Design a protein around this ligand. Structure first.
Ligand code: K2M
Length: 435
């Protein structure tokens, strides 16, 4: 695998030991061969699991998620997917790693797709080797891969709202269930219904994942209600997955606004990773997978791939060259390569709107490309009436940094800034000048 111009897809089935058995062997060989190596974890939670798998090996953990004291001599670095892409975008020296290892390489967040584009381009240029570790590479059509123990697969109507009757099989179960929902708001309603029926429910989403995931170890629970973030190496001691088989798809309409379309079917890769949370113990056959819909290739035209192009257009590669998306996922976007390349000052603004601003890539790009500076929030109030953001069925209002109460009506509307109460609170803080 470790030879230059090699990109290897390590596609062993979910639970086959890619992270705990194969990765340490790769890392040992990389150190022996004096390959400057990067390991990319999708989340802080996986970064901490990897330290356990790699324990004693000389690895520099470039994350506060890991409590270890470095020798200072490590030639292997570990960081999050998003951290790698962020550092590429910033005026920060990123080593031209000889070996690029991405764990949970199916992750479809913009920064992960962009990292795969950058890495696979460096491999294509003859500069580097890469290993992408995932059971579900891009365009996989197999929702039911092999498992450590047999799984009982059942197609069944799954509730997406509170229910009074008709789904006794949900609550009759005496084990532990991981339930994939399409959104935080949908999970909140199902969680309230289960809690009312006497169940102990933990909710997971991107923003809450590190705090709330610990509760799956520290408290007794009956259900985990999770968004798709639990597709990325989240492990549970569960015997059932309930899978809506639904997700939200961010869609750019008329190059002008982003909507959260759907819910709609998950990809085969997503379905396989959701199912793959169970069947992991060869001594516990008959874990159950209940699935409430079919799969479709809903990544086609999904905003994350356009946003990945916006990131890659702003990453230095060599002179004016621009990294391409990883070939198997390159047709998910129609973009002119280089169309989103910004001049130095607008790029710095773009980066700050994503990092400190916590804005979606697409929205950060609209603001930065308009020549607006990071702290100038006038655009949060001067949109068309149809861009009015709502709170409790009335237009949302903030006090501006000038002390004026104004309706929140952004010039560019991205549904992700108000998709749940937490998102709206954050965007209200942004519009008021509070970060
Ligand atoms: N660019 C980032 O957001 N990184 C996370 C913090 N980084 C470390 O190396 C680190 C902090 C504590 C122990 O390691 C640098 C990478």
């Amino acid at each position: 695998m470790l030879k230059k111009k090699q990109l290897t897809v390590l596609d062993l089935h979910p639970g086959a030991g890619k992270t705990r058995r194969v990765l340490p062997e790769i890392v040992r060989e990389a150190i022996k061969k004096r390959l400057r190596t990067v390991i990319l974890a999708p989340t802080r939670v996986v970064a901490a699991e990897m330290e356990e798998a790699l324990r004693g090996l000389p690895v520099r953990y470039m994350t506060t998620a890991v409590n270890v004291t470095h020798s200072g001599t490590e030639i292997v670095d570990l960081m999050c997917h998003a951290t790698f892409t962020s550092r590429l975008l910033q005026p920060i020296r990123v080593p031209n790693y000889n070996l690029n290892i991405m764990d949970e390489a199916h992750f479809t967040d913009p920064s992960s797709i962009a990292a795969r584009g950058y890495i696979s381009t460096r491999v294509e240029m003859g500069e580097a080797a890469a290993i992408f570790m995932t059971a579900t590479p891009p365009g996989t059509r197999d929702a039911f891969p092999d498992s450590n123990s047999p799984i009982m697969d059942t197609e069944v109507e799954v509730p997406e709202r509170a229910w009074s009757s008709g789904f006794d099989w949900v609550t009759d179960h005496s084990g532990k269930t991981v339930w994939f929902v399409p959104s935080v708001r949908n999970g909140n309603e199902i969680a309230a219904c289960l809690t009312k029926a006497g169940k102990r429910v933990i909710q997971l989403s991107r923003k809450t994942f590190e705090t709330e995931f610990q509760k799956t170890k520290n408290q007794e629970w009956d259900f985990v209600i999770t968004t798709d973030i639990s597709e990325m190496g989240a492990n549970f001691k569960a015997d059932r997955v309930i899978d809506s088989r639904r997700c939200l798809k961010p869609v750019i309409l008329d190059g002008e606004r982003v909507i959260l379309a759907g819910p709609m079917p998950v990809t085969h890769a997503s379905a396989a990773q959701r199912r793959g949370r169970i069947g992991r113990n060869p001594n516990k056959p008959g874990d159950e997978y209940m699935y409430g819909g079919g799969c479709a290739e809903t990544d086609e035209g999904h905003a994350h791939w356009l946003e990945a192009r916006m990131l890659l257009d702003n990453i230095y590669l060599q002179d004016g060259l621009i990294a391409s998306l990883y070939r198997p996922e390159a047709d998910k976007v129609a973009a002119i390569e280089g169309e989103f390349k910004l001049r130095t000052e607008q790029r710095k603004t773009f980066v700050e709107l994503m990092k400190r601003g916590d804005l979606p890539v697409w929205l950060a790009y609209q603001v930065a490309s308009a020549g607006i500076t990071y702290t100038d929030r006038r655009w949060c109030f001067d949109g068309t009436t149809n861009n009015t953001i709502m709170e409790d069925s009335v237009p949302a209002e903030v006090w501006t940094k000038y002390g004026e109460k104004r309706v929140l009506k952004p010039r560019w509307m991205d549904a992700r800034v108000c998709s749940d109460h937490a998102a709206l609170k954050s965007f209200k803080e942004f519009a008021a000048g509070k970060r």
